Amino acid sequence: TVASISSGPKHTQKVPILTANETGATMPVLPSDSIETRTTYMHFNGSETDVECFLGRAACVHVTEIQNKDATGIDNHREAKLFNDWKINLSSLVQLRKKLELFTYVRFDSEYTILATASQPDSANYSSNLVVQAMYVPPGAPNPKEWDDYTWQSASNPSVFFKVGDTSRFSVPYVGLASAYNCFYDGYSHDDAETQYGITVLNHMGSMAFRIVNEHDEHKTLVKIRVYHRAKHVEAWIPRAPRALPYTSIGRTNYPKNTEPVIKKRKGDIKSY
Amino acid sequence: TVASISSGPKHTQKVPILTANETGATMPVLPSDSIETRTTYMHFNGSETDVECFLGRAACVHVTEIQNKDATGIDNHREAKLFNDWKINLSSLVQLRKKLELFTYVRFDSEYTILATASQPDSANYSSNLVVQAMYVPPGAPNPKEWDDYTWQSASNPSVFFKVGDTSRFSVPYVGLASAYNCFYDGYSHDDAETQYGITVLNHMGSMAFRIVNEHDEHKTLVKIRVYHRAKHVEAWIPRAPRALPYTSIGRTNYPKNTEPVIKKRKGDIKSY
Amino acid sequence: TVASISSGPKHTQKVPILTANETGATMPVLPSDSIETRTTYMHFNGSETDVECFLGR
Amino acid sequence: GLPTTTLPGSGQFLTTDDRQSPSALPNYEPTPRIHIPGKVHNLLEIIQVDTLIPMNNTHTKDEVNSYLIPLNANRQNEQVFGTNLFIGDGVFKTTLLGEIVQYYTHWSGSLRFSLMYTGPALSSAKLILAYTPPGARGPQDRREAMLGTHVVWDIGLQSTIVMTIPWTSGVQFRYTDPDTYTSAGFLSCWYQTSLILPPETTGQVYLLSFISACPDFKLRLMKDTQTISQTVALTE
Amino acid sequence: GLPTTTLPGSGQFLTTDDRQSPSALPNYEPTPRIHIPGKVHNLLEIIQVDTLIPMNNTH
Amino acid sequence: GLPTTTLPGSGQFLTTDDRQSPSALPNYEPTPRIHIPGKVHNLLEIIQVDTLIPMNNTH
Amino acid sequence: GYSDRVQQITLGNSTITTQEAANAVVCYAEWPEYLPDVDASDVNKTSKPDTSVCRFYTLDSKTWTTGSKGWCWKLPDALKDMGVFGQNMFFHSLGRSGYTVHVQCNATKFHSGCLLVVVIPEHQLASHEGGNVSVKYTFTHPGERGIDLSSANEVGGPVKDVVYNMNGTLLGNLLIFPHQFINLRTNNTATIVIPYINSVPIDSMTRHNNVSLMVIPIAPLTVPTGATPSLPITVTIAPMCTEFSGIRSKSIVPQ
Amino acid sequence: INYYKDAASTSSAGQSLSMDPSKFTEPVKDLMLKGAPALN
Amino acid sequence: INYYKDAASTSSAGQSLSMDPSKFTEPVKDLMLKGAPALN
Amino acid sequence: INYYKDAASTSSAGQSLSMDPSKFTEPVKDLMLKGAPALN
Numbered sequence A, B: 001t002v003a004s005i006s007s008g009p010k011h012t013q014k015v016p017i018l019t020a021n022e023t024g025a026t027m028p029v030l031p032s033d034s035i036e037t038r039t040t041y042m043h044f045n046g047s048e049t050d051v052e053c054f055l056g057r058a059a060c061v062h063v064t065e066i067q068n069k070d071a072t073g074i075d076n077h078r079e080a081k082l083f084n085d086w087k088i089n090l091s092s093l094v095q096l097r098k099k100l101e102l103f104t105y106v107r108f109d110s111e112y113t114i115l116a117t118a119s120q121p122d123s124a125n126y127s128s129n130l131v132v133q134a135m136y137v138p139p140g141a142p143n144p145k146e147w148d149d150y151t152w153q154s155a156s157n158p159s160v161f162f163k164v165g166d167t168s169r170f171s172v173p174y175v176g177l178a179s180a181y182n183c184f185y186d187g188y189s190h191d192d193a194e195t196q197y198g199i200t201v202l203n204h205m206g207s208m209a210f211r212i213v214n215e216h217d218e219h220k221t222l223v224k225i226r227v228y229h230r231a232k233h234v235e236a237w238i239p240r241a242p243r244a245l246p247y248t249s250i251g252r253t254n255y256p257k258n259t260e261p262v263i264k265k266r267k268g269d270i271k272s273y
Numbered sequence C: 001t002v003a004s005i006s007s008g009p010k011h012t013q014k015v016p017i018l019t020a021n022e023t024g025a026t027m028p029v030l031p032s033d034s035i036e037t038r039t040t041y042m043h044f045n046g047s048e049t050d051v052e053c054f055l056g057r
Numbered sequence D: 001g002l003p004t005t006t007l008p009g010s011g012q013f014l015t016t017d018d019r020q021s022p023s024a025l026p027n028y029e030p031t032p033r034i035h036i037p038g039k040v041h042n043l044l045e046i047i048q049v050d051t052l053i054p055m056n057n058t059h060t061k062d063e064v065n066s067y068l069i070p071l072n073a074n075r076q077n078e079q080v081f082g083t084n085l086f087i088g089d090g091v092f093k094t095t096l097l098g099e100i101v102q103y104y105t106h107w108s109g110s111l112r113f114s115l116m117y118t119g120p121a122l123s124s125a126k127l128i129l130a131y132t133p134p135g136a137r138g139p140q141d142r143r144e145a146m147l148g149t150h151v152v153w154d155i156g157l158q159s160t161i162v163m164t165i166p167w168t169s170g171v172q173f174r175y176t177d178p179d180t181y182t183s184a185g186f187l188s189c190w191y192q193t194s195l196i197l198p199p200e201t202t203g204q205v206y207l208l209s210f211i212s213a214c215p216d217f218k219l220r221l222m223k224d225t226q227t228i229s230q231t232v233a234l235t236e
Numbered sequence E, F: 001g002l003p004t005t006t007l008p009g010s011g012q013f014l015t016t017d018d019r020q021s022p023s024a025l026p027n028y029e030p031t032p033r034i035h036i037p038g039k040v041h042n043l044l045e046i047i048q049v050d051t052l053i054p055m056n057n058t059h
Numbered sequence G: 001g002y003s004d005r006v007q008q009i010t011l012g013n014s015t016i017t018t019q020e021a022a023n024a025v026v027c028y029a030e031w032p033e034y035l036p037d038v039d040a041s042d043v044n045k046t047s048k049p050d051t052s053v054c055r056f057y058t059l060d061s062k063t064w065t066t067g068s069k070g071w072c073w074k075l076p077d078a079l080k081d082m083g084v085f086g087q088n089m090f091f092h093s094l095g096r097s098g099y100t101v102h103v104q105c106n107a108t109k110f111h112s113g114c115l116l117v118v119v120i121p122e123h124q125l126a127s128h129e130g131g132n133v134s135v136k137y138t139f140t141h142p143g144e145r146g147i148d149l150s151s152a153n154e155v156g157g158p159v160k161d162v163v164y165n166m167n168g169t170l171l172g173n174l175l176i177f178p179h180q181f182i183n184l185r186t187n188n189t190a191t192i193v194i195p196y197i198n199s200v201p202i203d204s205m206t207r208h209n210n211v212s213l214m215v216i217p218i219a220p221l222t223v224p225t226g227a228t229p230s231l232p233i234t235v236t237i238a239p240m241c242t243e244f245s246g247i248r249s250k251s252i253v254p255q
Numbered sequence H, I, J: 001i002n003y004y005k006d007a008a009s010t011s012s013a014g015q016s017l018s019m020d021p022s023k024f025t026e027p028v029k030d031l032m033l034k035g036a037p038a039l040n
């Protein structure tokens, strides 16, 4: 492939460099339309800018935490982090968010990796070996109330059991309702006068729930869960302007008030170098 | 495959929507018999509603517990949970039970996964590493009396040895006496006037027995066993009405007295939306 | 493989059920030598009684 | 010795994975299968059989009576019953259809709603059933109702009428647990002319109503049902 | 039983590796794709559209 | 190095499984078999020989 | 001029005519047939009394009144005493059978009411006590009398609550079982042909009933003005393709 | 590839792709045609 | 070699090697030739 | 596939499928036919 062809002096009536940008086109002008060039080859394919590659590496999408401790006398397991949940969403963390929001609709399978590490902030004789249980409560499913409920039975709910310190991994098809995931949605659930606005109304795919299978030892053990997400088989439509201001909420476009100028002011003139 | 064909106005003597339900049939009426439709395709196969898929994921069927402790002076190992047993049955937990009872007779191979985690509720210097031994005492076999009996020799009894925190897995053919497992049985063992009633008399396939191989350390260690069961190679006959009331017993159909209305009462009229 | 063949009434001079055990043999008598039977198949091979299986765990 | 590397996920137990395992009972021979009528292969086979809907939900303890929709002689213009179409909740919820839908997260497809009339043979009636697609309110009078999917039913020799709720939707799947964006409409029924009883006859007559799914139907993404739970393991 | 040896790196999680995984939802059927104008395949496709430069940065 | 994943059950010992193992005595030559009357192949062969029943159990 | 409506069933030495039928149901779309060899296990030749057992027995009549809750019969129990069918039953170790069930209820064009006639394979009943109380033998072997769902709880008997099918499932879903309605305005009989359904090729006829036939009023009976407020319901049932095997001494069963 | 000798040890079965609701939805003895009168 | 049955479980996709910026860079209704005048 | 060199290291043997009880059930010198008299 040639990156530049050889081109010499020109004295024409045919001027490729004068255009009318009002038309909305970006005319494909090249170095050889306005200087004299020599042949050179590309030596490159643009492999690593493919959208599959761009969205295809694992990104941290969520960090939660649960603890193993005596539940005796706990009136609210959920509240004691005897077990937590993550109401599946990819808008939490902004690193992967900005990347995704470069497009309007996106379609992909997900591969999740879940790393779990334990901490024992206060005096323990040892490090126990705990087994985590991650179960996906599809919307319209009995939500775990306790840490050893009947829900954890998950007889129809896909669940994975792995050891703390270890990692769990699996992949999920694209479980979108539509033909693709809406990165943006300028509409509402229904024609109400108070109903929410955005995608937060469209992206209601239940939540994930973690818990430690093991009973309690004499000390307490903090287990912190990190969920990583990798898109595989990516398809993206309609590019948009990149995010400039900071994010404030999962699912709304809102930016913070009295934010700071995002364009760097010159130290000098327009004329400055 | 078409999900709907195109159909237009009708003014006939041939009315597919008038039927006689007294006959016991559900006549196969479609949208296109009563409105004007356009062609649309199915795009779907009904893969995930196959009975193999429906009964084919692991469900928790049993949680038991045994402990490792000094048996010195224990007059009844079984009673000290020096070792326990599970009198194999799939009616214990109701999550997988309701699913199975959607059919009358069911035939399948079983794949068991056994997760074992340890707990040390009171002061230990460390976490020991225990090895569990799960042996299936077929009915008419010497039942373990102690925790280091001659029975544990299991020279003809299939047994598996795995580490606590780890998982054990294997699969078993369908060991039913008949051509299929009876989900229901409206009969008795014999023509007696006091003999039990149900399947609890039909499903007598012995019990499973767990124990910790390791001797006792200075502290005590609680090991809690969870048995998961996955049906593979499923065959199901005669669908029945789903279970509406709560369950009270393994193997009988009995529901609790002064149960609550299972049909949600309207907040409003018959006419209400 | 048939487990039992069909067999009907008998009024013979040929009695397979009378033997002399003093000989040391176990004569291969079947249900169909003394009652009327219907055909049935074995559906079974005797796999799990092979000595390799019996001593092999 | 062949060199290997283990990946993330090694040793995990995923209740939904499907792999081979050693048989604990090597060489065992299962009982022969004999023939049994009734084999089921897909849950899609059974949700096409219709079952009764406790439409008359207005009672206070479960009773045979909540299956009966009453009809009054001589009323004109008025409304017989109304319900939204959240097949995973409300009237639908205990029906076989409702009961299976609840094992899945998403559904799509047409529904078949039929009414069988049980009044004396010498009576007569004309009813209108109307399906209102998502976007409008439950109709408030027949005029409103008759502008959407509807069937004038003439009660005759042929005892049942089968109304289809054709799949009307932007999004190709709806959630089985009630959700707004994903909502499916309303179903109402009104007198078209009115029920008329013969002489020597009196009182209320009832309609029985059934629901089953058209062959159109799709259910996906299995999950656990809110319809069953427990607090301690059961014993014998 | 086939003899194996595990190499350095076993058990690591590299966010950039690309391998197979079990599907949590065996047999599930995704929604059909419909046509949508605008598909992007390479970031190289979009950086050829011109956009305005805040050249007058002096504010 | 070929990528692998280990499944649930790894490391378990099931007394009924049937796999290959290294021989501790590589290259050893067993004694030749000679003929011996009486070989049994199936327990089904022997349960067809009749034996006496202590029917008069009353002692 | 054949209508779905008129029918004749002749079986043995007995015939039934209905002039107001609503087709007939054949459970699971299969018609009763004898036991094939490929499915056989017991080596005994079986006995097929044919026409002496495969005829129509009419059980004693019931009375539908405005307060009726429904009735339940078990098979082969209901026939335990009918002619030679019953003798064969007590005298062989094993037996097998399919049936034609014909439920009859006629009224006039001024009555209203609708019965559900359903056959439930393996209908294991529940104890009204809850817990794991069993249902004694006698209680699940009512004989030709059947069980009257509007009778009182008894001790050791089953629960008789209709909206729960006597087992923890809702009346509304019984429609998944082969069934037919009798709607006075349409119908006057219900006919169901039952093939033999079991997990074994042949079984005991006394320790296990393999179907319960259930007749349940759903739309209450409403008679014309100053009519007597009740109608009789009659059940006639015929064993079909019956086979008995393992003859001997004659079973003795509780009570 | 099966690594094991017994059939019980193989993975899940593969979709019936059988599907025939008529034993449940139309178990009537005389065939009913949609469009023709239910009761003649 | 796929070891798994479902398509979601396969590794990353492979390069589009599609690449056609004209839907974005030249969505004009009447075709513009470089070198010819923009507005005639 | 055997991974090992020695025969002892291979898995269990496979069913004789030999089966001949006559060495045990009928070791008589002169052949006895069922149905013919035992002692002539």
Ligand SMILES: Cc1cc(CCCCCOc2c(Cl)cc(C3=NCCO3)cc2Cl)on1
Binding pocket: A088, A089, A090, A110, A112, A134, A135, A136, A158, A159, A160, A172, A173, A175, A181, A182, A203, A205, A208, E024, E025
């Ligand atoms: C846009 C966009 C895309 C997504 C991803 C939605 C996630 C779908 C559900 O994914 C899971 C499934 Cl199918 C299973 C499990 C799981 N099974 C066993 C343990 O976890 C977890 C998740 Cl997040 O969210 N917003």
Ligand SMILES: Cc1cc(CCCCCOc2c(Cl)cc(C3=NCCO3)cc2Cl)on1
Binding pocket: B088, B089, B090, B110, B112, B134, B135, B136, B158, B159, B160, B172, B173, B175, B181, B182, B203, B205, B208, D024, D025
């Ligand atoms: C219905 C129905 C089906 C079942 C399942 C019965 C289980 C049969 C026996 O299964 C086992 C076998 Cl064959 C072996 C082992 C075992 N071998 C080594 C460790 O455990 C465990 C079980 Cl549950 O119960 N009710």
